[PDB]
């Protein structure tokens, strides 16, 4: 169980350590990614000047690889070379192949603006660059945890928990309902998505602890946001509406067996640094393809979540507290 800092309901990171000298880093634990990377002491990028860095020469368990490698995200690209060392997470440890990031200039509105050091991917092997086995999968094979599964509990603002290996029943109320993945790549399930009256049937729903908002395709969201008198502030991913809006629907998510719903409180919040009568919609257009939605943090802040590699599925339940 790993404690997660919450920053404005948009970002969550917790502690991890690399190496013999227990070098601490803050990691976005990221179910939409499948590589661990940390900024190197050889990272010259401005983003890196405020981060905790990794010194291989300090760790006696460090093993050299040095193969060059790149990871792209929706928010930018990092670049470095592979290295091998022992990664610790809570009281769990394993050797792991990870990225010493050297150039983080391409992540660089976000990286210098945020307080995270690196990303720790919690996706499947096939999503990863270099075909690396996931931490939780490996941990189970080494018999360091009871089951190859992990759990996210995110709050609403004043901590959250990544929990590896077992299900803690205190995190939720009522029944836990699992959903088979349509592919073992992202944590991705089939769903009929309703945004009010606009429906896309059997969409590709991607459960991602590393995405701050709900996401739909641009085409589908032009439709929805048009008739919702919102406004985009020119040229940043900020859609604003009045905080007292009666028309904002509870979004719906149907599976072959289960209905999930997301109320407006979970997908919007006030601009408390600007005008608090105006409200910011945690819904962004992101085009992956014709039918992919990211069920990001808004979803997860309502719904306690279980990612189970043994079942190849995601378990959802209404979070407690």
């Amino acid at each position: 169980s790993i404690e997660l800092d919450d920053v404005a309901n948009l970002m969550f990171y917790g502690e991890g350590q690399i190496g013999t000298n227990k070098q601490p880093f803050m990691f976005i634990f990221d179910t939409g990614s499948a590589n661990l990377w940390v900024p190197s002491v050889n990272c010259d990028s401005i983003g890196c000047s405020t981060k905790h860095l990794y010194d291989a020469s300090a760790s006696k368990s460090y093993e050299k690889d040095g193969t060059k490698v790149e990871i792209s995200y929706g928010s930018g690209t990092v670049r470095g070379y592979f290295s091998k060392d022992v990664i610790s997470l809570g009281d769990l440890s394993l050797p792991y192949k990870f990225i010493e990031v050297t150039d983080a200039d391409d992540l660089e509105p976000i990286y210098s603006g945020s307080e995270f050091d690196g990303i720790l991917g919690l996706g499947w092997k096939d999503l990863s660059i270099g075909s690396i086995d996931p931490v939780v999968v490996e941990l189970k094979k080494q018999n360091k945890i009871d089951n190859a599964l992990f759990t996210f509990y995110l709050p609403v603002h004043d901590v959250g928990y990544l929990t590896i290996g077992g299900i803690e029943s205190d995190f939720y109320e009522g029944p836990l309902t699992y959903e088979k993945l349509n592919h073992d790549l992202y944590w991705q399930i089939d769903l009929d998505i309703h945004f009010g009256k606009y429906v896309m049937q059997k969409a590709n729903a991607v459960v991602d602890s590393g995405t701050s908002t709900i996401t739909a395709p641009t085409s589908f969201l032009n439709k929805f946001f048009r008739d919702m008198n919102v406004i985009k502030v020119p040229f940043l991913p900020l859609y604003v509406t009045t905080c007292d809006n009666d028309d904002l629907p509870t979004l719906e998510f149907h599976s072959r067996n289960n209905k999930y719903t997301l109320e407006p409180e979970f997908y919007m919040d006030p601009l408390s640094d600007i005008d608090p009568a105006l409200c910011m919609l945690y819904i962004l257009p992101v085009d992956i393809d014709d039918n992919t939605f990211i069920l990001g943090d808004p979803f997860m802040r309502k719904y306690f979540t279980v990612f189970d590699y043994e079942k190849e599925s995601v378990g959802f339940a209404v979070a407690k507290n």
Partner: peptide, 6 residues
């Protein structure tokens, strides 16, 4: 904010 891989 943040959208996390390609």
């Amino acid at each position: 904010x943040v959208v996390x891989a390609x």
